[PDB]
Amino acid sequence: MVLPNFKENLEKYAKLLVANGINVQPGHTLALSIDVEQRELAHLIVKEAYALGAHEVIVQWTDDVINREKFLHAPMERLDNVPEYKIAEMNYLLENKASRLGVRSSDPGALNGVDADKLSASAKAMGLAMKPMRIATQSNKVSWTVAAAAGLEWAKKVFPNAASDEEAVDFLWDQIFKTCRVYEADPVKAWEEHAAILKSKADMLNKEQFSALHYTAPGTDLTLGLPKNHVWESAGAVNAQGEEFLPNMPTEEVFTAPDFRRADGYVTSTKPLSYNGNIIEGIKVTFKDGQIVDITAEKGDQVMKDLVFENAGARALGECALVPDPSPISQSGITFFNTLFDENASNHLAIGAAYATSVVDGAEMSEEELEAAGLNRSDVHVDFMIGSNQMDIDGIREDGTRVPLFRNGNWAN
């Protein structure tokens, strides 16, 4: 009743993810990563990928229940290293220049109750093992896309007051479809014009080349430097083959990397965060000389401290992203407990790695150059959100001039 024409819209969504998200070309290999619960969507994705000429789709199926049992019951020795066959699966994808479509539908609290040290050692072992792919991906060597599907446990958390499970799920798909423009009569046109409006804010920032940004809101007073020759990006990338693609659907942000060596001040998080299958609440961070010097959370405090102080590069920032508080996901009043959505509802920062493309010619830079360019290197990249309708930001020019950028959570003018 809340979601009429479901099957048709779902097929319309699948088509979008494949034609416009990844942009499948003849001869391509597609890796789809997706939850078993979402087989219906997976079938539609795979059909469309072959209809557009893919030579091969490989589906890597995930499942929260089974992943939780592994974490809960396997010994550390199965959890703290990556077996060779998984590395060999990754290399086959790399070898084939596989596009990577990731459809997220997991329970935000999927791994609640798992020992802290196993989540942490598994994420470290994987972050190190999967690095070649992250590197290839963070530099648009292949098309990649992150998108969502309405998992049942996720939907119950997003809408705890739903009249029933089905209603919770309908409401989530409805948000997915609306933010991905699936209801538009011409979604491609609509995506093109959404893209244009963000691209023009990004161009305006690329021209200013601010030296730093200063954020202010209650619980927040933070100054972040920006690298020399940084690129603000949004909605739309071009891969190392001339092909256009959408890295995130939905998306409402314009973003770049700060200079990882320059951060002072403090910041209060305004959204929860799902990290390692746990929900983290009430995060606060203090920065000094470019480094995290204290990190705290009302729930999940130990998860954050372990993120930050036990992975290299994680005491520094790799992304700063702007989203107007009046934009549609922020305005829906929904908290998603999910990074792809909540990050497109609110300004956000990332702990850990900078995308290579956040600096000019960054996609052909070595790790050494990227680092010297002021772009943080890390095996983790963990977005947390800091915007609100009370937030002001100024851009700071090279001569210290303060330019209003955001006022009360929206572009200043």
Contact partner at residue 74 from its own copies, Zn ion, none, CB < 5 to 8 Å by partner kind: its own copies
Among positions 2, 65, 188, 412, the unique one binding its own copies when judged by CB under 8 A: 65
Q: Does 91 engage in binding with its own copies (CB under 8 A)?
A: yes
Please state the closest distance from residue 383 (CB atom) to Zn ion, in A: 4
Q: Using CB under 8 A, which of the segments 78-86, 141-149, 245-253, 347-355 binds its own copies?
A: 78-86
Contact partner at residue 204 from Zn ion, its own copies, none, CB < 5 to 8 Å by partner kind: none
User: What is the number of alpha carbons within 13 Å of residue 11 lying toward its C-beta?
Assistant: 5
Query: Closer to its own copies at the Cβ: 56 or 115?
Result: 56
Please state the closest distance from residue 42 (CB atom) to its own copies, in A: 7
Among positions 2, 8, 25, 92, the unique one binding its own copies when judged by CB under 8 A: 92
* 213 residue type, one letter: L
Distance CA 53, CA 311 (A): 41
Contact partner at residue 255 from Zn ion, its own copies, none, CB < 5 to 8 Å by partner kind: Zn ion
Query: Helix, strand, coil shares of the chain as percentages rounded to 5?
Result: 35, 25, 40
Dihedral sign computed on CA atoms, order 15, 17, 18, 19: positive
Element housing 49 (H / E): helix 39-51
User: Residue 22 burial by CB count (10 A; 0-12/13-18/19+): exposed, middle or buried?
Assistant: buried
Query: Closer to its own copies at the Cβ: 154 or 191?
Result: 154
Among positions 159, 245, 255, 406, the unique one binding Zn ion when judged by CB under 5 A: 255
220, 266 contact by CB (below 8 A): yes
Query: Closer to its own copies at the Cβ: 30 or 297?
Result: 30
Q: Does 372 engage in binding with its own copies (CB under 8 A)?
A: no
Cross-strand partners of 190: none
Residue 286: which residues within 8 A CB-CB, separation 6 or more?
A: 265, 266, 292, 293, 294, 295
Please state the closest distance from residue 12 (CB atom) to Zn ion, in A: 26
Residue 355: which of 373, 340, 335, 342 has the closest Cα?
373
Q: Tokens for 72?
A: 């809960």
295, 285 contact by CB (below 8 A): yes
Q: Does 384 engage in binding with Zn ion (CB under 5 A)?
A: no
- Phi–psi pair at 132, nearest 5 degrees: -50, -45
Contact partner at residue 350 from its own copies, Zn ion, none, CB < 5 to 8 Å by partner kind: Zn ion
Query: Closer to Zn ion at the Cβ: 46 or 198?
Result: 198
Contact partner at residue 19 from Zn ion, its own copies, none, CB < 5 to 8 Å by partner kind: none
Query: Which residues in 33-62 contact its own copies (CB under 8 A)?
Result: 36-37, 39, 42-43, 46-47, 50, 54-57, 59, 61
Query: Closer to Zn ion at the Cβ: 65 or 197?
Result: 197
Residue 215: which of 282, 268, 271, 291 has the closest Cα?
268
* Angle subtended at Cα 117 by Cα 111 and Cα 121, rounded to the nearest 5 degrees: 90
Contact partner at residue 228 from its own copies, Zn ion, none, CB < 5 to 8 Å by partner kind: none
Please state the closest distance from residue 332 (CB atom) to its own copies, in A: 30
Please state the closest distance from residue 243 (CB atom) to its own copies, in A: 20
Task: For the chain, give the residues followed by a break (C–N over 2.5 Å).
Answer: none
Distance CA 251, CA 99 (A): 19
Query: Closer to its own copies at the Cβ: 69 or 298?
Result: 69
Q: Does 166 engage in binding with its own copies (CB under 8 A)?
A: no
Please state the closest distance from residue 255 (CB atom) to Zn ion, in A: 4
Q: How many Cβ atoms are within 10 Å of 115's Cβ, its own excluded?
A: 12
Binding residues for its own copies, rule: CB under 8 A, are: 36-37, 39, 42-43, 46-47, 50, 54-57, 59, 61, 63, 65-66, 69-70, 72-75, 78, 83-85, 88-89, 91-92
Binding residues for Zn ion, rule: CB under 5 A, are: 253, 255, 319, 321, 350, 383
